[PDB]
Design a protein around this ligand. Structure first.
Ligand SMILES: Nc1ncnc2c1ncn2[C@@H]1O[C@H](COP(=O)(O)CP(=O)(O)OP(=O)(O)O)[C@@H](O)[C@H]1O
Ligand SMILES: Nc1nc2c(c(=O)[nH]1)N=C(CO)CN2
Ligand SMILES: [Cl-]
Ligand SMILES: [Mg+2]
Ligand SMILES: [Mg+2]
Length: 143
């Protein structure tokens, strides 16, 4: 299944933390990275934001366990690995809200996602390209 994960880091020099985190995501079992977006500089010092496409055979909460582990291990206020989408699934549990409960209100999540999945359709049928048009979120600057 293709999971889309958002990465956020607000360290002054976040590149090594993000690269450590990306490598770790690629080491998750029954999973592999498909594509990584560019790194974007976004106002809060700045955040570095990126999106990752991860193919995985894991269950959603199993993926969550891994992302939470990486946050603690690669964490140093903190590093953030948010599950934006999991296939076309709707998840509403105590641990997991998928799609991410606010991503549609955040240019810093949608723009890096649009770079790597421009044709994305949300589970409720909304179109990523349309949200970006209607909300008129300024394109982000690259890190
Ligand atoms: N889609 C999702 N991705 C990651 N964590 C999620 C999630 N949906 C719910 N959570 C829950 O969110 C909890 C708290 O996560 P935090 O990372 O501290 C919130 P945040 O990412 O700082 O703010 P945000 O959710 O407004 O982006 C986790 O313990 C996890 O169970
Ligand atoms: N610019 C920017 N702002 C944020 C971000 C983020 O990734 N980028 N993440 C947040 C909570 O998870 C709160 N605010
Ligand atoms: Cl949705
Ligand atoms: Mg977050
Ligand atoms: Mg989070």
């Amino acid at each position: 299944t293709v999971a889309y994960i958002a990465i956020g880091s607000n360290l002054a020099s976040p590149l090594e933390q993000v690269n450590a985190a990306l490598k770790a995501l690629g080491d998750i079992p029954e999973s592999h990275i498909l594509t990584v977006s560019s790194f974007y500089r976004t106002p809060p010092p700045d955040y570095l934001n990126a999106a990752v496409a991860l193919e995985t055979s894991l269950a959603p909460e199993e993926l969550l366990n891994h992302t939470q582990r990486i946050e603690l291990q690669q964490g140093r206020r903190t590093l953030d690995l948010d599950i934006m989408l999991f296939g076309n699934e709707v998840i509403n549990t105590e641990r997991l809200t998928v799609p991410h409960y606010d991503m549609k209100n955040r240019g810093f999540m949608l723009w890096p996602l649009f770079e790597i999945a421009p044709e994305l359709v949300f589970p409720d049928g909304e179109m990523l390209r349309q949200i970006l048009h209607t909300r008129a979120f300024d394109k982000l600057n690259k890190w």
